[PDB]
């Protein structure tokens, strides 16, 4: 059989770039969170909300490419 | 390149060279140092107690 | 002699092997299969350089005068103090073995890397005819076995100390509860620390090896490819720059060894 | 706790041991906990919060200065 | 067959690069937003407003590509 | 002709790079914008203007790549 | 067959890109953690709490990707 | 088979890479410009003059490569 | 057969990416460690403790990668 | 024929790589210049002199790479 | 035969990636070391000690990869 | 045919990578150089003296690869 | 001969990555060294000393690279 | 190629190497040697004053 393996490769491109962009994107954001915490510990629970709130936007596109990656991996065989 | 029994032949010369330097070079050449430091201390303790 | 440069650069890669199976010399054209074929050419320079180390050391250590040190003695106890200062900085414990080990590592490997500095066909052009040998690669370190021989000779010590100074107790603790600190995560911790420990020595051996293999390689290429009248206008920069490479790559060997062991115990 | 001194050119405004303080720095707001690593900055005019040891909070007003 | 298969690779590439682009841009912008927050906590709402007003731009071209990903996966398949 | 779905790849690449470039460039610019705003929270109008003034140039080139990608996908392939 | 050996290529790409992402993310986050701790050395444990939180978050997609990579390596 | 699809892909590489270059370069330069402006609200015009001068030296290799991608498409393809 | 030449390259790619990620992700962390040290050396032992404690985490995925690379390149060959 | 349809890919990649190099390199350089101007605007024209001294040096390689990219697209084909 | 065509690419990729990683990481570290030294000479030696501590962790995976590159290029190729 | 063209692809990659490296490195060094002037402008000549030594060291390995690209293009054709 | 054509690309990848790495690393390191020298210009020689002491570590894997690249391109080829 | 020519070409490089090293690499290290010699001598003289 011939057709299948090449599509699994296409899933690697989907999820490999999603891991990179998602991990390093938040990593930057996670840096400024901790730095802010160090300058004002008594705001650490306040800022914690603002970290997540923006983090939701960070992984928006990575989440799309995640959902499709497992679709192209599993569902489309 | 290719791994060879040389890996074990050299472990001998290594480990033994370490001992035939440790047991007869290192403490000696640190003795020649410490035995001079003990002297460098005395002149200073002299000068200070003599001022006193 | 029909020495095409593609083949001249090839021969220098060969080793003077002994087919201990036949107690024979393994010819370059056919390489016998076995693990029992000593690379004599580097191995012998191993003991040779360890001797030029130890004899010039004992020939003061057994003869040490604490007066105004001779202009010769000066350099030897200079390096002595340098080494001991570094060791005292990065190691604090009682074990006597660490400092002499570091000294031997440092100077022995410095010399083993040094012997690359002579023109690389000098001894291979002499030994072919004065002795009847097929090959002789001078730099002991440019073969993996010796570099990994020393890496494993320090891994031996790592195991010795890691079990001694903290027994089975702390050794097993760090090997079970790190990094993730939860008991359910012990399966996570195991493999990670496994090859973490196993990589540290191998990376040492290869850090020493590759630098010198590709050191020699640049000399082979220049010595073979370019016409006589210009090999200098490149061998000059490369050699004087490789001075720094040999120095740093031995000093780094010493530092990382000391750090591995001191970190294990304390 | 750590020892806090608020002194002007003329007189001593506060002293004694503290658990934390929050100051408005020239660059941004700040907050100093014990052991905080050495720092030097200007401060803007405005309040400063102290928690005297055992949580007794109080606000002092400062016209400026240097921390 | 291959006309069917390879267009999924050609979509996956767009989806991965859109992942990286959007994640990185929003991460950096959110990092500076958090850093402003920790230093000017009373202005948090104003900077929040400005953060949305500007994020709206970074997220535009990536969401061009994101929808084109579903197009080429399905609109042609 | 097995070439139809290959132009799709050229559009995919061109527009993925468009996404990356635009997202990252304007993310950096918006970060510095917010960092300026945090200092001069009264001057948000002036900076928020200049931000558009220059953002209009940052993404100029990627916009063209997006247009050409659509051209290739639809008006050619 | 050609069907088997390419999948190792796909898995290799998943593993490599997940390694890049996870390593760089944790490196940046740890660097800011270290300097933040050097600033307030008495709050180390609280900052380590809030560090582990986002360290978990950042390895979400890289651990998903490693999962699928090992899947393709052994689940087929 | 090896003509058109093989040209559009080269044009895509060219213009995509020029997009990345222009986007990120002008992003950095504009970020610094906004920083300076927020520091010095008096020097906006002098600073923006300097900005345009240097931006002229950022943009004028992307202009080359983008025009050349168009030449590939409209003068070969 | 051509299994083994491709198997070789797959390990080479995965482990090259592992090497880049680990090198840079540790370099950054060590750079911050050193600039934290130079401002007050007396904290060197504590911060070195923290440095190893953290770096053991960064070296999680690259170690997995090297393990699989050696397995493929030797066990599967 | 492939031998000369594909060259446009080589020229494409060569000067596409040179596009980001020259652009980003000067974007990095112009930035420090702009913030120097904003702090000590008294120095500007002398700063601008120093800028140019190397401004061309950054374009040492990208230009020759640009030329050799053209030569092929216009003299080899 | 066909093996020697691939083997050297399967090596060069490994070694080029290891080079990128090692050089970039070591530079990122060495910069923070140097500018720290220039603050406080006579802290130079302690910082150099710690720099040589940290450099040893950077060069681990790159050097494993270089060792395997030399394996492939001479134990196989 | 393939014989003669692949060397042009090789030269394209070989010199494009070198152009990227040289441009980025020289740009960063020059940026820090310029920020040196902006702070102690009477020190221009000394910083200039040092810059060119360091800048040549940045261009040391970038220019040998460019030369070998030239050789491949014109020696091997 | 087939070996030579495939090899003259395998070497190109190696030396291009070598150039990028060895340029960017030295650029970062030289930039920090320059700011150091500028801060305290009576220290230039000591700074150059430590600079070289670090430059060697940076350009080790990049030099290992160049050697094998040239070996391939002229010893096997 | 004729190996004789490569050997002579190598010897040229090696002499050009040594003649640089002997005015750039030997002086500084013997100056370190001499510095430490002098600095031992001074700590001897110090004790010889102290015994006054």
Give your account of this protein's structure:
The structure is cut from a larger assembly and holds ten copies of chain A, two copies of chain B (52 residues), one copy of chain C (266 residues) and one copy of chain D (67 residues). Chain A has helices spanning 5-39, 44-58, 60-75. Chain A has 77 residues and is mainly alpha-helical. The longest helix of chain A is centred in the N-terminal third of the chain and has 35 residues, at 5-39. In chain C, helix 3 (71-90) crosses helix 4 (98-114) and helix 6 (144-164) runs antiparallel to helix 8. Chain C is globular, with a radius of gyration of 22 Å. Chain D is mainly beta. Helices cover 0% and strands 40% of the residues of chain D. Chains F and H meet through helix 1, helix 2 and helix 3 of F and helix 1, helix 2 and helix 3 of H. Chain D: One of its GO terms (cellular component) is plasma membrane. Chain D: One of its GO terms (molecular function) is proton-transporting ATP synthase activity, rotational mechanism. Chain D: This is ATP synthase epsilon chain. Chain D: Belongs to the ATPase epsilon chain family. Chain D: Residues 3-67 form the ATP synthase F1 complex delta/epsilon subunit N-terminal domain.
TL;DR of this structure?
This is part of a larger assembly, with 10 copies of chain A, 2 copies of chain B (52 residues), 1 copy of chain C (266 residues) and 1 copy of chain D (67 residues). Chain A is mainly α and 77 residues long. Helices cover 86% and strands 0% of the residues of chain A.
CATH class of chain D: Mainly Beta
Radius of gyration of chain B: 22 Å
Order of helices and strands of chain B: HH
**Gyration radius from CA atoms of chain D, angstroms:** 11 Å
Placed side by side, the strands forming the largest sheet of chain D appear as: 1-4-5-6
Separation of termini of chain D?
18 Å
CATH superfamily of chain D: F0F1 ATP synthase delta/epsilon subunit, N-terminal
Q: Pairing-aware structural class of the strands and helices of chain D?
A: mainly beta
Structural class of chain B: mainly alpha
| Order of helix and strand elements from N to C terminus of chain D | EEEEEE
CATH architectural name of chain D: Sandwich
Structurally, the number of domains of chain D stands at: 1
The rounded distance between the terminal residues' Cα atoms of chain B is: 71 Å
Largest sheet of chain D: 4 strands, antiparallel
Function (chain C): Key component of the proton channel; it plays a direct role in the translocation of protons across the membrane.
GO molecular function (chain C): hydrolase activity; proton-transporting ATP synthase activity, rotational mechanism
Protein name (chain C): ATP synthase subunit a
Membrane topology (chain C): Multi-pass membrane protein
